[PDB]
């Protein structure tokens, strides 16, 4: 699934 941050989000 997606992260909280999103795939485009920071690490």
């Amino acid at each position, epitope marked *: 699934p997606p992260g*909280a*941050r999103g795939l*485009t989000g920071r*690490p």
Partner: antibody
Amino acid sequence: EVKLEESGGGLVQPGGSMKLSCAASGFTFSDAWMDWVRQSPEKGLEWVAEIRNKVNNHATNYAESVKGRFTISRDDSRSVVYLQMNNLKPEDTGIYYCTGLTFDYWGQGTTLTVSS
Amino acid sequence: DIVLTQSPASLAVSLGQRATISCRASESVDNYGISSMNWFQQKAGQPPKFLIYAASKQGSGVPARFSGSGSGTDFSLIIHPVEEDDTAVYFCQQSKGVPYTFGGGTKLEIKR
């Protein structure tokens, strides 16, 4: 399907105020980091403001060019992100996209023109 | 501010051929082992569509032909084979830290 609908753009005088809002569906909203990004032909894509999820204390960040003027916030119960904008300037003119899961998903955009 | 510079500005590729767009970062967007570099496509009159994350990894339902590469400060986006519907502007974008910054954009024209 994810849907992001922005609202409340339009015309406003320099110095005036404006509140954009962004309804979202198709992902667990309370978990998602949400942003606002703007586009003008002069300056391209500018990230404007971030608001993070409940787990990160609804932490906000802002571009330097809007600090002290723009407030981002969210209503997790209504799946809405707001962007209050104050003391608006001609250079704030652009298309304002609301994005979800940082930049994974983007709304259609709403147009803000700042001009007397 | 990590500044992103794309090149070229515009670019005309025949159908079925390779399109290569570059993105140079003012400093390293590597955080951990992951290069925090994303790519977006903007067709006319539309928002940007997310394509590639982590320099080379592809978003959900993004065709095999879109693929990125590079690490550190230098990055590419390859479209191959190019198709009619790939006419668009392509933005690189850095998520290493706030502020998040985008590139200038590169228009891909389709030769016909």
